[PDB]
Design a protein around this nucleic acid. Structure first.
Lengths: 57, 55
DNA sequence: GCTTGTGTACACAT
DNA sequence: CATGTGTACACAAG
């Protein structure tokens, strides 16, 4: 997975979002603070959906 | 789900990432482009256990 | 005194 | 009437 720092992430956000749209999952990191992932709403919405059909307790 | 446009996301990204860390899922929209979602890595990693449909 | 994060603002493009 | 995208400045935090 691609991993880019905040400063770089923002300074290139368009290129990041373009990369994301191409199917790449990009990790956003910040000093100390917990990381995040930018992923296409479609993919992630379809992850959430497939997870919701798990016969577990 | 919270939904912000690109210009606002780039200009408030720190506040966006703080919101996400608090458990929020944030939709980023772009003109004529498919939307993206910024989500906590922990949550995302857990949601990819959806890849237990592929199996 | 670096690096990186955060606010912000300007200019051009769509 | 706005939003996307490059970029650059300055201050804060580490």
């Amino acid at each position: 997975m691609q991993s880019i720092n905040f400063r770089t992430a923002r300074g290139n956000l368009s290129e990041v979002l373009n990369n994301v749209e191409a199917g790449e999952e990009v990790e956003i990191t910040r000093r100390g603070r917990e990381p995040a992932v930018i992923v296409s709403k479609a993919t992630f919405e379809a992850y959430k959906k497939a997870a919701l059909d798990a016969e577990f307790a």
